[PDB]
């Protein structure tokens, strides 16, 4: 595959503001600083570590290309 | 098997609008752009990346065949 | 084992209407069209694909035998 | 190990009414008919299949011994 | 490692009353009777079996040492 | 990789107060005492054991460096 890495890499490279919705409906915002297979580092005031198992959808704030 | 891939492939191929309900009850809509074993790319204004672990049911907006 | 397959197979074979409760408390209804180890295809108007990780309990609408 | 099997086996053998609380706070009741590593069959009017990943706690309605 | 076993073992040995918060926000209380890698047996009136996948945090009711 | 360990190690070393949001929206606070791949020990009055599967995001109360 796989689809995650190029999607997230594009967001990180272009420094696209994103909305990350968590499995509880709470929305987080910022720019994807780095990621691996378990977490995303989400930046603005501080870097916060978001567990992928808690994420429902990642929504870019503007159209982003990759594949 | 397996049932997922042909179901999602049919939706993607026929460009069938779908409703994706997440484990928190929130409903997402659009067309399935691509998928793998971990995420679905869901399109309309922007492509958003939906984690399969956060999805409860995928509901096509009209009858779709595959198997 | 295992208990899942004969329980779900019986429901599918006898075309027993079932209630599927999801981990968020939302109830889905219909007849089990097919399943594997990851999803259930639940039919009535359209087939919808239900992720087993999102299901809490499967409730037949009438007594069903298998084992 | 392991602790699950003797606890659930005792409940099943003694036909002890149990309360099964699901991860969403909904309470189910009945007697444990059978189980494996993925589901519990919970009986009263009909047998319902409860996914262990959706269960939070199993509460016997009276003191039960095993180990 | 690992951190779980000595933390839970200390609680069990010292028979420290604990609060177990579940992933849905519901609080359970009692003393940890036994545990393994999948469940905790939580005692007071009856022993109840708590699935670790449903637990969010284990809060001792008083300071407990181990490591 | 991997990103978790250096992020959490920095927080633990610098004894940075953190907010840990759980998958249910409840916020926990304190200082990260120790962690492994399954839990975080979160300190203030008592040490509490937080299951990583129940955590959504870890938010430092001030900017923290590592990588």
Swiss-Prot record, chains A, B, C, D, E, F:
Outcome of mutating residue 12 to A: Almost completely disrupts the ability of Hfq to form condensates in both growing and late stationary phases
Q: What is its main location?
A: cytoplasm
What is the organism field in this record?
Escherichia coli (strain K12)
Q: Which residues form the Sm domain?
A: 5-64
Question: GO annotations under biological process?
Answer: positive regulation of translation, ncRNA-mediated; regulation of DNA-templated transcription; regulation of RNA stability; regulation of translation, ncRNA-mediated; sRNA-mediated post-transcriptional gene silencing; tRNA processing
Summarize the subunit comment.
Homohexamer. Interacts with H-NS.
A GO molecular function annotation here is: bent DNA binding
- Span covered, complete protein: 5 to 71 of 102
Question: Any keyword Ribosomal protein?
Answer: no
Outcome of altering residue 27 to A? Almost completely disrupts the ability of Hfq to form condensates in both growing and late stationary phases
* Record flagged with keyword Zinc: no
Q: What does this gene product do?
A: RNA chaperone that binds small regulatory RNA (sRNAs) and mRNAs to facilitate mRNA translational regulation in response to envelope stress, environmental stress and changes in metabolite concentrations. Involved in the regulation of stress responses mediated by the sigma factors RpoS, sigma-E and sigma-32. Binds with high specificity to tRNAs. Binds sRNA antitoxin RalA. In vitro, stimulates synthesis of long tails by poly(A) polymerase I. Required for RNA phage Qbeta replication.
Listed result of changing residue 5 to A:
No effect on Hfq condensate formation in both growing and late stationary phases
The subcellular localization recorded is:
Cytoplasm
Please give the family membership noted in the entry: Belongs to the Hfq family.
Report the protein name in the record.
RNA-binding protein Hfq
- Keyword annotations: Cytoplasm, DNA-binding, RNA-binding, Stress response
Q: What is the reported phenotype of gene knockout?
A: Deletion of hfq seems to lead to a significant translational fidelity problem. Deletion increases persister cell formation. Deletion abolishes the antitoxin activity of sRNA antitoxin RalA, preventing it from neutralizing toxin RalR.
């Amino acid at each position: 595959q796989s689809l995650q890495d190029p999607f997230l890499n594009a967001l990180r490279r272009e420094r696209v503001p994103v909305s990350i919705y968590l499995v509880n409906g709470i929305k987080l915002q910022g720019q994807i600083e780095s990621f691996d297979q378990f977490v995303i580092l989400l930046k603005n005031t501080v870097s916060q570590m978001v567990y992928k198992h808690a994420i429902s959808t990642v929504v870019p704030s503007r159209p982003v290309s990759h594949h």
